Structure 1
Amino acid sequence: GQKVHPNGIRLGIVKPWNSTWFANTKEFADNLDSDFKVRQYLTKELAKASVSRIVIERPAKSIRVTIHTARPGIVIGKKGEDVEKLRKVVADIAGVPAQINIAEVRKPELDAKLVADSITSQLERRVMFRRAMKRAVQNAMRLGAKGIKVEVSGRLGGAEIARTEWYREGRVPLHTLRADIDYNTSEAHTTYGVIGVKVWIFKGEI
């Protein structure tokens, strides 16, 4: 198809960037790379957690790190006992000063990476696909939504006669670029090949 990156649209209206910090052509490359390294380890060790956004401010080229969680469990009952360890990795990779700031999403499971990673994990334990997605679609509407639309891949069982699981639900426009829509990507993995996971949730307006 001919497609357009969905949250790639609403940059500057209400959607931020993840590398916002001024810089020059020499270090543009370098600092970009530098962030993403540390992100890889992060998400995997914070897959005991449902994570929600990550952004960098470089306030003095001494980083910031404003990782988001949706569980507050990261910082309660391992209050810094945890977080230190993460900051430690930060220091290890980034040879400039290393500091960490943790934010919270009170939304538990709905919108952005939260329905992303959630629905992936289910496929990867081979929870009933048909019924699985259906429960995750009533859920997000319980907690309220103006409509959510997941789309996953077909070719179940490795073969194809047409049985691709689709989902639209609710109302999910994309004409108005000021009625603001969430989107994340994530991918499941199966022992017959990768399945796409793409979540398009309609909460928002400016």
Structure 2
Amino acid sequence: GQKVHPNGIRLGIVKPWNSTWFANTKEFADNLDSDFKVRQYLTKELAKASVSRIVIERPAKSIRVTIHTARPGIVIGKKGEDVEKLRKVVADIAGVPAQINIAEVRKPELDAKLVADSITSQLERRVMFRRAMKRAVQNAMRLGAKGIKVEVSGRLGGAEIARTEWYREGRVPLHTLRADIDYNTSEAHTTYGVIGVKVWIFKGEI
């Protein structure tokens, strides 16, 4: 309730931004919603490709996009034709031509969001949280990751007074600026209320 966004103060030290472009006072706001408009687009449409982050770059007023997702195929379907439908719709609400590049996430169970994602669905469909939670923790642990720390808020288990669980493994040095700590949320708004998930992963070293 006071810890800074662990992805926050790492911008520039380790973490590069999610948007990379330039502007001025006139259009800066105008750009923000538009790129937020596409973020709003893909986030709704691509649950099933397991998206981790979408990277926006405005080159010479001709937007470029990257989809950080698990299945480079399942976002494009077959022959990749499907993403062409996805390519042009993007530009429209953006305003400039767009080639939509894509990056395949290699350690799927290592990016925070996808991990935090998986937790949501498992938790979203009335499945016991701990049976997945600690299963989830142990997963990337032996796949090789110095530390993992999941945290779930809410009315877990269909409870009636809310509380918070968590879990921790290895190291999660949240004061070391030198570190690499992926981080994401992916809430869970089940039948009973809304429950959250926070995961800290000390995936890197410097």
> TM-score, normalized by length of structure 1?
0.91
Secondary structure (helix, strand or coil) at the match of 1:53 reads strand
User: 1:176 Cα deviation (Å)?
Assistant: 1.1
- Would the alpha carbon gap of residues 156 and 56 (structure 1) be closer, same or farther in structure 2, given more than 3 Å must change? closer
- Distance 1:82-1:107 versus aligned 2 partners, 3 A rule: same
* 1:110 shift after superposition: 1.5
Deviations 1:42-65 (A, max 9, x none): 122211111122111101111001
SS in 2 for 1:157: coil
More strand by share: 2
Deviates more, 1:88-97 or 1:13-22: 88-97
Tell me the C-alpha RMSD between the 2 structures: 1.9
Between the aligned partners of 1:8 and 1:94, the Cα distance in structure 2 is 26
What is the percent sequence identity of the aligned residues?
Answer: 100
Query: Which consecutive residues of structure 1, in runs of 5 or more, have no partner in the other structure?
Result: none
Kindly state the Cα deviation for residue 19 of structure 1 after the two structures are TM-superposed.
2.0
Given that 1:113 and 1:185 are in contact with CA atoms closer than 8 Å, whether structure 2 keeps it comes out as: yes
Tell me whether 139-148 or 67-76 shows the greater mean CA deviation: 67-76
CA deviation after TM superposition for structure 1 residue 164, in Å: 3.4
Contact 1:71–1:108 (CA under 8 A) maintained in structure 2: no
Residues 191-200 or 88-97, more deviating:
88-97
Q: Give the match's secondary structure for 2:137.
A: helix
SS in 1 for 2:64: coil
Q: What TM-score, normalized to structure 2?
A: 0.91
Instruction: Say if 2:64 and 2:100, in contact at 8 Å, map to a contact too.
Output: yes
Deviations along 1:141-178, one digit per CA (max 9) or x if unpaired, are: 12111110011114335545686322122221112110
User: Aligned residue pairs: how many?
Assistant: 206
Distance 1:35 1:108, change over 3 A: same
Partner Cα distance (1:163, 1:34) in 2: 37
Q: Kindly indicate whether the alpha-carbon contact (under 8 Å) linking 1:154 and 1:165 is maintained by their aligned counterparts in 2.
A: no
Cα distance change on mapping 1:94 and 1:175 into 2, 3 Å: closer
Change (3 A) 1:13 1:166: same
Is residue 19–residue 32 contact of structure 1 (8 Å, CA) maintained in 2? no
Cα distance in structure 1, aligned partners of 2:176 and 2:29: 34
Most deviating of 165-174 and 51-60: 165-174
List alignment gaps of at least 5 residues for structure 2. none
